[PDB]
Design a protein around this ligand. Structure first.
Ligand SMILES: COc1ccc(S(=O)(=O)N(CC(C)C)C[C@@H](O)[C@H](Cc2ccccc2)NC(=O)c2cccc(C(=O)N3CCC[C@@H]3c3nc(C)cs3)c2)cc1
Ligand SMILES: [Cl-]
Ligand SMILES: [Cl-]
Ligand SMILES: [Cl-]
Ligand code: NA
Lengths: 99, 99
């Protein structure tokens, strides 16, 4: 699809068996989801943005379905105010910015 | 152009006669630039990023070139980890996300 930027680019994702709304975010290196449980191992990480840093859990090899397209990669889980799909998964669904 | 997302989507901007680097950021409603001098009056604004809220200075109707495209609109000045071009100016340069 071609997604307009007149509005926030929100899409439905499926992760861990759960449906969520998430922001397609070209400014995010990594994908960051609000607190939830995910299977398998994880390790702690700090990520920073406006306002400073938060601590997250890094899970590798997690499958997400993003607006109907499956992708696999690392997902960070922690107290983000918004679910963010970052470039590590946008690339896998072939997302580009066009102007 | 068509910009893939394997690398950060960094572009050159020109504001106040100065070239700077900035990140095209579909997850930001607003454009936020590091401390600099801009003309005119400013208004207060709070923005809530991943780590908390910051205060910024809001300047309206500022001339800014983005990747060679002319925009005139609101620029927020404050402590951001990188200069970010948000949707208020991505719409002015005609950007869309596509997959
Ligand atoms: C390493 O992986 C990382 C992943 C994400 C980040 S980040 O979330 O901090 N971020 C990085 C840039 C600052 C370099 C991504 C950026 O797109 C964030 C995404 C983000 C959206 C909403 C809340 C928290 C994070 N936006 C803003 O900072 C930002 C800047 C200026 C204005 C706004 C804005 O429009 N917001 C703030 C709250 C309300 C409104 C929005 N709500 C939503 C739902 C979308 S935008 C966001 C950092 C590291
Ligand atoms: Cl990854
Ligand atoms: Cl590609
Ligand atoms: Cl504007
Ligand atoms: Na894993």
């Amino acid at each position: 699809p071609q997604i307009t930027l007149w509005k926030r680019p929100l899409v439905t994702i499926k992760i861990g068996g759960q449906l969520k709304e998430a922001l397609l975010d070209t400014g995010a290196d990594d994908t960051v989801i609000e607190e939830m449980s995910l299977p398998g191992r994880w390790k702690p990480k700090m990520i920073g943005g406006i306002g400073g840093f938060i601590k997250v859990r890094q899970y590798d090899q997690i499958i997400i379905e993003i607006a109907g397209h499956k992708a696999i990669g690392t997902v960070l889980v922690g107290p983000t105010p918004v679910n963010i799909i970052g470039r590590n998964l946008l690339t896998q669904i072939g997302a580009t910015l066009n102007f």
